[PDB]
Amino acid sequence: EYTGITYISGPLLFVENAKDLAYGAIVDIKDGTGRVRGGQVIEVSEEYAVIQVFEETTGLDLATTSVSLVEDVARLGVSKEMLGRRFNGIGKPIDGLPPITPEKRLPITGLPLNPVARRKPEQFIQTGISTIDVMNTLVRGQKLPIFSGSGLPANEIAAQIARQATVRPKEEPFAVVFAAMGITQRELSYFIQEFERTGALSRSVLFLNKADDPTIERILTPRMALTVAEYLAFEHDYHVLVILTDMTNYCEALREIGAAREEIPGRRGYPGYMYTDLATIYERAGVVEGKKGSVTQIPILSMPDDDRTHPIPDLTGYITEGQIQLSRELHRKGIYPPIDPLPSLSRLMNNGVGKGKTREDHKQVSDQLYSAYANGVDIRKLVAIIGEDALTENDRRYLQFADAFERFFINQGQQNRSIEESLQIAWALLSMLPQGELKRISKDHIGKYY
Template structure:
């Protein structure tokens, strides 16, 4: 039980979504903090750089209205984590794992780091089992196999979202006794696209077997970087701890790769590598994690 919490009050500079804290060398890179604003509200943030002089915090929400003299922050978690549970199936969340479907928060069975679980390459099995997508050109010409990563490249004006939604509602593993679920992650989508996905999942019944993460274009920039990691962490939990067959669909990866927030992180000395997101895509034993990222080129 935590009896006291250290507060940092030496905030000396705010620049856009970045908050600079002097003398906070004991904060660790990647730690999640709570920012206490003078109006009583609490905002979230993540440590993206620690030096001898300053710690740099990227704020999840806007920094407008923050008073340097009256704003403080405290450590919430040593690394970005997400609460996971079987009850997440059938629910919708934002990129940070907070419910956005109007239902109560889940009671997590575990809180796992969104950096993902390390996979021993020796544990990987040769992909062999077929996943039926219901789209003949994929099933016949470029078959999706359990434990495989299969990108979908699209161009402007082509129905990439419609294909992603169609696969989410039609995909299934034939002749298998294991439970099958879909983890769907959307990054940088518009309100119109979000409404389309919500309608597709709810009207077709696909939501009953899916965990949906949605990051809108006007959501905090750092949330866009955390959305696919949160989705893959939940998928790892369902596959490797609950022995389910999991298909991960990520759209649109272009918004993750080219968003200006990646340039902010790079400017602060941190490189966000897209390859880090696919290390967990693997078939192992009776369970498998399969990835289907959508890329607008």
């Protein structure tokens, strides 16, 4: 059925229909355009008029311009053949190959499949990075954010995990879904070249959204990516790892339209709905029904203005099972990866460690390293207050342990550390502390492992 534009303000277009109103979420097509221009219905205003959001620029639209209702929302051309292809935010080819030949056509909001099981995340994902695998282990079904800031190599880490990740002897096949949002042409060319050269592309679906692509296409990008992941995990029984960079850039686009949508702004100018839209993305992870597959997320959260309390990064923390927080201060000291060892945590961590998973002493070692590093970092403050020479012998050992933790445990010369390798480094650095000061390691473990 056809309608006519009655109003245009930036990305928001009002459209009046004389017969049949299109339901909320339907994709409408603007007639008379050189390139396809989609309008997604957002509201019914009354008087046979709907309010919509454009998926591309609205320059050149005129009042009265015709619009058709496609009869459905937007969708994913789902197939195992998604693997090995590079696509746009909307799932259109970017690799000069033919459009996907769908096995099924899936809605992308998260309603399709109802894939998740009511079971806890478990079992190992080997990223090949020691500071993750050894100390902050990623588990199948978990959401473990990379917490960073502008100027830091968060995307290098994301790309490296995409190249290296596997599920060591699993009966299930492994796949990566890599989605980039609001990236430059240079960054897009780099990501493409990297996937193609390494042969990482063979087991990956890649979605790339450029900075100059429509804001609506950026909003749809993570939904295309999560739908592909859920399809591969649930219908093909795969352990799928989804890497989303950067959630902050996704948020800048969603925030950009909230104003055009008529909402009263919330703190820091953000959309009032920040946490319930973001929840639609972090809810989509975990073991899938059947327990053959799973969806794991590694979202990148850059601090705007390096502020971890900004509403975007701050609301993302609850959606994760492991967090890796990068710090500019640490990067400026030449410590890479620039991980803050006292602000990186593991959640569902207890479900993926111990005898029969990693090793029996894993929790004790993790607890002791965390405690000693936190004490050592506070003592850096105490050194500044009193002077190095006024520090007690015992405190000096904890001060030194913090440097050892940073130099040897956090720092990896790019290098795929097994959990055994990571625990060994952990025990080696722990030797710097007095044995009498290992409050968080039971004597059984000291005798067996020290």
